[PDB]
Amino acid sequence: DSCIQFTRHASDVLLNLNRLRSRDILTDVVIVVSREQFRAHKTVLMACSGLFYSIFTDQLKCNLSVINLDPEINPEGFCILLDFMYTSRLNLREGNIMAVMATAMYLQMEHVVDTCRKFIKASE
Amino acid sequence: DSCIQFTRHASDVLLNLNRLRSRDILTDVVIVVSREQFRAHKTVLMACSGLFYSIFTDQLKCNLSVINLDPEINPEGFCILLDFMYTSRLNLREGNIMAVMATAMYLQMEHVVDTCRKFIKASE
């Protein structure tokens, strides 16, 4: 086509989706990770995670308002990944890298899994 | 903070939101523009438009499944702007620029209004 493109548009959209999440606006699901609860937008979770994409395209699970993750999932690792989904920024630290990588593998977030593998390999 | 950032994350999220729109997955509103109907995600519309942001933060309008736009709004101009919201690409042409600019002013999409003004000024 002969379209023009606004370079900052995708980043501006994601910033506004994170503002809606922070104010709990039009969030339609709560993700339960052991004792912890995280409110989010189903569409953003699907857009970021192969696991959520599979869950919310399922004809019965698409209608659930609560999703319980596997008990082995660490709430902090989930929180870090949820923040990444809505911002593009990953808070990866020596103290959380193992939990973040395991959560990213479970959530099927291949680019996160890739950077965790590389950061671990460099420390070996 | 000490975060790392994935450069293509925002663009990848927007691409997946457009894929969900094309397959009509988790769309929660229909925008009526005279005889034409457009299905979309309320969160994406709010993230792109000052008008939709105001509409869907309203305590009664947030729950509507159908929104009717002003009869002066051109369906093609709306279609072009909806495509822009989900892709960052604007199909701006001599034959549609006036309808696109008027629709962008109504929808409160200031960056689109700005490029339309500049493209019109250059042709004068």
């Binding site: 023009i4 493109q5 606004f6 | -």
Partner: peptide
């Protein structure tokens, strides 16, 4: 704005 750019030519993509």
């Amino acid at each position: 704005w750019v030519i993509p």
